[model samples]
Target chain A: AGYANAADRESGIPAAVLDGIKAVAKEKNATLMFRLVNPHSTSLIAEGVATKGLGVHAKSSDWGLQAGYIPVNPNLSKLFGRAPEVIARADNDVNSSLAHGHTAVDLTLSKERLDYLRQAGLVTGMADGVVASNHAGYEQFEFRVKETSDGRYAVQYRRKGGDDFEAVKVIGNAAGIPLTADIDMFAIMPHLSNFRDSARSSVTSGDSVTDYLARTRRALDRERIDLLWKIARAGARSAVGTEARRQFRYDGDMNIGVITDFELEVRNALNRRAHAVGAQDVVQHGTEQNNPFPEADEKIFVVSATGESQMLTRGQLKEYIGQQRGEGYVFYENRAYGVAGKSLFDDGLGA
Target chain B: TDSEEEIREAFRVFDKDGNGYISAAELRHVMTNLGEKLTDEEVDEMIREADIDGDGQVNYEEFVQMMTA
Candidate 1:
């Protein structure tokens, strides 16, 4: 009735949260927003695959989602602090039937950066896993942003469903690119955004990209920053992703490389938040303002999505521009945003 | 697919836990976020149109047949 029932699913969101997810998902027409799905052994798996495979020495999750154990990784052991048996982090949750799937984002790490993180003692190497969920669950009007060049934030936005990646919506206010230092977050955003909008598509002076990040970061507690980063990568326990595209051997493990994925995923959501763009803006559309009126020879009626009305062709309906609380709508600067209200040709599409 | 199975799947998608029925609040939660905000009359009309059994709640079969029919 309240939330206890909704909480029973694999998703931990409640009714309100589910509403949040639906709004975002429908707006974006997308299935993923931000996921921190750690591939923990499911109740059904140790229970499901403890039985069958392709005739079948294979293993799978209880939801019929299959799982694979990474041989060399210690992340499972490190986190669970036990035998390496915890390495079975790979799961074909949505893939086989496309119910839920896993995608391992391999943020390639190089020698210099690997050594940099190693020397700074950050992580072992690179590579993080992600679960591409298609549960029709949640989609955030979200995007990722990161430092590139010097001061600008390179942004990427998720495209509608069917297109695996999203477009970019840069927001730096033309400020100097802040950090040329190969930041991990940048590595993830540019890739995930599907590289569409240029770097400054949504930035102004007052709340520029860097400007917004400064305020939010200051407000944010430092401890949770790490926690924030860790929530992005889902399939990190895999022993395989850390392979630096170039070299076969390295000092630190590949987990260090994964830092970029986490940082990128986290920062993308934040930077987009800072830009004040994405699905949330329109979700609260305020007013759909359906103008179902007819037209004349050269009518010039003023209208507005909100605000004063004006006349366009100087025709029939004069002050067709009025305001109501619930279904808000108006003409722009006295111009009809569409055809005359809901005429015959107007299939609610506008006439 | 013709009747029962299709209906069950539709109910499952929205039902979340498959508790046998969907409440009005649940339907409201899904509708308002969708295209062109629905009016109060529209909401009433829809519920009246679908909650065929006169029960405050809608079970899978009723929910599906209401939608399909």
Candidate 2:
């Protein structure tokens, strides 16, 4: 809504002049075109109407006339100074198809180029910011106008094909509205139909990695297969738990990793579930180096009453047992009750 | 341990404001940018699970434990 709302506000074409154009569109069922003719022919075309020929009518006392062509004059530049171009249209041409042949100019300046021009004294004035391109024929196709310190001016025209703006300089004066260094508006501003197609293509270019992860997780969630469970299993003091654990490891299809990435999602799920049930600490996973015993890598002996202890290693276990035995703390080889160590395998086996 | 540091760096990217917490708004913004437009309720639920103390935001420790767990 904010985008098309640029139609509001003042423009280079006066209200009276615009109304004349709209009236002609309603009365003739034909759209109006504008051109720059010599002073000698301004009235010949302005007073007498010709078949299929555009006519100019003076809607304003000022040189800001309506429809057809205006006599090339100093005010031609001034008219453009206020706005990029004069858009005229008749009613019934809802799609703006009739105004395809209108004449105008467009220019674009990058921040670097704008700065360069400012330093070179080619462009001047604060940005007009007023982009009112909601005329019947020029719907949504807008441009901004800025006056140069000199007689020249620039119209920051939005290209129909992309999110690009071109600052245009029309080199027309009292002599004649001749094509000079600047561009012809409609020729440069690609057709609106093609613009819509390109804009659609622009939108269809985003997101792959994240979408893949989303789909992967979505399927996993639907299947009720907890990702963490695939990586590690809970304490297997129970037979069913032990069977599941055995398959996860010894089965021919198990595999995983990506170096320092740490398989974070799996570990996160593991830590979350462990902590979810108020586990005191998590024994960090280890590398599968040559373990002295089969059960060493598969088990994590957790003590409930002790303050946050991530007990690890056979030597540390020996030291803990010695100290606890000295203090009369009972040690169970496999206690399923106190700290439910969700083993990396379902079978509480060190495997 | 170095992985914890790596996880923290990832957390900071989502935290946005560096306030040591990931708010629901921030999470929604990032998710939307990532091409998943999560609803307010979904965004809140994501934060709620990892929001240990129920402060309505996910802090560093919660985020760390979430990724690690």
Candidate 3:
């Protein structure tokens, strides 16, 4: 199927060049790694809000996982008009809250996140926006490329809600291709409001602090998945038109095939019970009177692709689904679920 | 009382190879030994701020100056 597909289309570009571009684009896409940074620690906003009033501790507040993107392409400097600065540039500084141990994850994840952001910039073509920030929620940075004038790509860092971004670094020259910096800000900052907004609302009988925190994390993951889908769709468009050969042959070329393959791999890797009992299907099945697991009568598959069969609890299944979707899985049982291999766990106790 | 020579000696402990510069990786090792763990990204930022020369490496002179200054 792969060979036939390649032979069907002839773009006249050297197969190696086509493959090279694809490899570069795929690296660009895969470079976009997402880290679920300290959802438990980062989501400690409720504790703060309960103690410190809104906007008082808010300036010092930082919530949600810190997502960083590091550009993998050595030539990204040529494309971005700026050299690949350290990922999580804000966190790199000693004064940043990230440096102060606000979030507990290694720098590799930070680099991965920055790579994704840089790749997004190249793919989407947006020139300016907050690429990353410190845990204080204050320092934010943006990137700009002026191909017509200076012909260089520049990165500017500034405090949030501040004027005049300081030119911290620059890359590329005017004669180079104008690098793209398009990103789905809404997707990237999926729960920006959840993090930025005050979590002062009173918790009801069913709603606990854990539930609220889990929802906030889920919101951020949802945004990321949505953005990834958007990127995949855009790649699919390119594959059908101008860059068919590159799309198929190169791993970096973002296309429908790669996206679909990734999505399937995720689904297959999830617990079978979770796959059997989908959120949409469960919602469609309707509910019983006052019963949480109303659909308990519904039998779901619990497979271990490795040829082992095991039973997984509803909680486990939900966690599996959540992991596959890269989001927080919250069930009507008011329990929060997270992925643990093929199984799911009740992560309500913040474990 | 520690003299400038003593402080410079202390800086040498972190200087590792005695190249008069500390890479972010080296800083990570130093901070880890001190029980103050730092991520590679954080260390890189420290080097960026302290190195001043943009050589991607921090010299012992710059390290000592930043430590005290």
lDDT of each: 0.26, 0.31, 0.28
Output the better candidate (2/3) by DockQ: 2
Predicted candidate 1 versus true structure: per-residue lDDT over A159-235, tens digit per residue: 33544433221111012111110111101111211211111122212232334457665742333322211111111
Q: List where candidate 2 sits over 4 angstroms from the true fold.
A: A1-351
CAPRI-style grade of the A/B interface in model 2? incorrect
Q: Which candidate comes out best when scored by TM-score?
A: 1
iRMSD, all candidates: 22.0, 21.6, 24.6
lDDT of 1 by residue, B19-69 (tens): 556665544433432211345544454555557788776665565465443
lDDT of 2 by residue, A11-41 (tens): 1222222233334323322211111112222
**Tens digit per residue, CA lDDT, model 3, A104-181:** 211121223234434544223343433433223222334333222433233444444667654432111122111111
Worst-scoring 10-residue span by lDDT in model 2 chain A: A182-191
Per-prediction DockQ? 0.01, 0.04, 0.01
lDDT of 3 at A102: 28
Better of 1 and 3 by DockQ: 1
Best by lDDT: 2
Query: What's the DockQ of model 3?
Result: 0.01
